[PDB]
């Protein structure tokens, strides 16, 4: 396992995808031009995982940019790191989606999917040992969710033995009070349960609460929310990009974190929580399992952990990490399943991000994530009971039965989390 | 002289095999470039160390070893390490995509793409042997390659080398330095499919070695480096009878005769003493009776179990160094009634003793201090079933919920194999209970 | 049939077409196959001007469809703060109950329309109103972990 092909779809996917490249390029010593300016040798050991190698020691990010809105490409080009992207990887259509999952998945998006797959094969063949794909998108819109899931099913047919990893942004009325978002989100979850190997659930509801209440921001913006997203995506991919003890394998991560195929939705966490303008080991382990440090609006103390992976970063005592983690597992033993022995793995890396000296990234497969799916299901049913704006989807060639099946599939997902949450070993 | 071929599978098998062959060269006096000044017979010979080392026309001594792993990361260090000039380049076999800690990926899918190439390279080494007696297989229980590919390899070697013996050095999983959560699965799956094809297996409990490095060596956070150096010290004491002159366990067939009373119970327990830290270079040299007393202490064992809870069926003592035979006879005489050592009624209550009058060799950079005498006890006790019980319990916890099973079913393996492998482990625990534990 | 043309005119938001049709005797209280009046569709699609014009021409502000949905139910669900105040201004029942047991307060709480929740409470929204599952508006806030909504319901 080696190279990873990055894909960003929609306005949110390209926005959170652009911030992902601006952060790791700073950690690897890469300037917007591409010339390596790092001051340590470890910044180039596993650099080939996310970057190509152009002539002249130039590093080209293995990223594909797609959106039905033609104005998003200028939003990315005008960015700071918007010049390093390969001009051949800009696939933008003419007609947008208008927050319609149907236009992205059946009409407007079905015309643009073949143009993207041509550049996916172009990138997948320039890899020495391709391991999987990485996608950033929101589930509330129409492009990143309707065409994003369609792009996944297309890649799943031609690359079935490769790992599909997504960073899906969940909608929230506290950030976007668009009443058709529970539709597109529910229809996307119906596809993500079947065609993804591991999905990071980034909830705008939790992102808003962290900025508004934890960071004391009366009016959080998309820049403030994405600051928590960029720091999260950097931590969950620290082992994939830097030398350490973990094998940096997408499949090894999926085998050790997915006990049941449908339960592959992770609850990311990060500590410490800081803002854009501005701790010990026992404090990082404490804040890590705190509900205030979760990127999903779910209380982990309301459910039971199935599998947990904690990545520590910075210069810290290797022995103390094994002490505080083992101690936290005892004080919260009622929140770990007893039929999965040794279900908490600990990783530690020596290169922390900039601005901090220590950090901790939490990746938990918890049954408490059902509270997220219950929130979207309750809003979906409320709108679907009255059939509000249902003609916006049937007019694009969608069947009404696809809503009840998505509602039924998502309710079955919730019952599955509750099933293993009440199970015992004896 | 009968040649022995060593096989190293997976990261654990390769890294431990690297430390063992380093120690073999230091004990035999072989330079890292394969030269041996004290080998007056150039181009060949009939010496005892030729069981593990072949000789070329230029006087180079090459190990009879094969390194195989489904990914090249671990073996590439052996290709650029200190002994990069020692091994045949065509005996370092590497794939591209590993088994991802999946027994099914190593046995049914990924392992099939390189199994025929590995056997052809083993065939080349077998043709150079005049009287090949068997193989030594190094692998882990928890890894996808160490469990899946090794089982596929052992099944093939039985068809191509039916009369030859096969011995294992297996790595028992430990939560302190484990890699995967499904390691209880892989360990049970590989034990069931390899039980028929293995004549004798020495299990190394990573937790037992981990505690020894903490207590005896004062190492707070032991790494794989500290574990493998101590493991190689014990592997050398076990294979010393095959590589030097002696009258105990002189060939692989005698290993089964002295340690294995019945085919299925071929898991002897190994104990080593003394283990002294290198920070104590001016330590007191323990007597023969003191190091022999330390063989029946559970804290010095390579597998976490209490031999007082079980009965012995065999017991061999391999001494190394300044050891007078009358001191061993006096020691065993006292350590016969002064302790609660129980032998089964159908076994001759005795102790086989072999003495090598050369003290153990320490490696530069190791954690162990030079000792003038040491002992390695190999005993087949029913108390080692305690380790199978710990492994079978963690297996039942996850399989009762069918957790992580879809990863195995999706790789060409049927779910029914999980049950018959667990039933085989149940029949193995009964084998020890029918003897007494 | 001018009633069916008035339904689509209120849905599409054609203000000029609504006036001309009502001048020719169009049934302002006409219904579709599901019982939706022109006031239902106008409050659903955010056509505030058509809402006020219909209310001045004999539109039933408390009309229900086959599922018991009043214009206040749909306006609170979609989140039209301006239309909700106009409906409440013309005597809309703030505590009307649909077939699912929901009130306008329930739908605004579920969809996160905090401003609408604040307006309904000031107009006499029953905080003790239960749905067919026994949940009230405050039960939705606690079950969903919405502390912002919980503070509004604790005035
Ligand atoms: N004592 C010791 N144990 C090791 C060493 N390396 C790995 N292990 C153990 O082996 C187990 C995992 O098996 P590995 O050998 O690393 O995996 P593999 O054989 O390469 O198979 P893959 O899953 O495909 O990578 C872990 O539980 C480790 O504790 C080592 O160098 N020394
Ligand atoms: N965290 C975050 N969320 C975003 C951002 N941009 C859009 N979103 C969310 O995405 C949803 C809208 O989907 P969008 O991606 O804009 O539509 P699309 O063009 O069809 O993919 C809204 O609910 C927003 O909350 C962003 O920059 N950061
Ligand atoms: C519950 O048991 C376990 C949980 C997690 C384990 N490993 N976790 C990872 C996580 C990674 O990135 C976040 C890796 O980088 C992609 C990664 O590469 C190997 C492993 C291992 C476990 O035995
Ligand atoms: Ca010779
Ligand atoms: Mg490996």
Residue numbers in the entry:
A (entry chain B): 1 to 278, 284 to 431
B (entry chain A): 1 to 437
C (entry chain F): 13 to 167
Q: What is the paper's account of this structure, in its own sentences?
A:
A prominent example is an azobenzene derivative of combretastatin A4 (azo-CA4), a photopharmacological compound that binds the colchicine site of the αβ-tubulin heterodimer (hereafter called tubulin). Tubulin is the key building block of the microtubule cytoskeleton in all eukaryotic cells and among others essential for cell division. Using time-resolved serial crystallography at a synchrotron and X-ray free-electron laser, we capture the release of the anti-cancer compound azo-combretastatin A4 and the resulting conformational changes in tubulin. Nine structural snapshots from 1 ns to 100 ms complemented by simulations show how cis-to-trans isomerization of the azobenzene bond leads to a switch in ligand affinity, opening of an exit channel, and collapse of the binding pocket upon ligand release.
Correlations between maps in the microseconds (2) are less homogeneous and stretch from 1 μs to the opening of the exit pathway at 1 ms. Initial conformational changes of the βT7 loop follow on the microsecond scale with further rearrangements of the loop, including a displacement of βAsn247 and βLeu246 occurring in the millisecond time range. Further reorganizations (black arrows) in the microseconds open a channel between the βH8 helix and the βT7 loop. Interestingly, some of these movements are reverted in the microsecond time range, where the βT7 loop starts moving. At this stage of the reaction, global movements in the α and β subunits are directed predominately away from the colchicine site and may cause opening of a ligand release pathway at 1 ms.
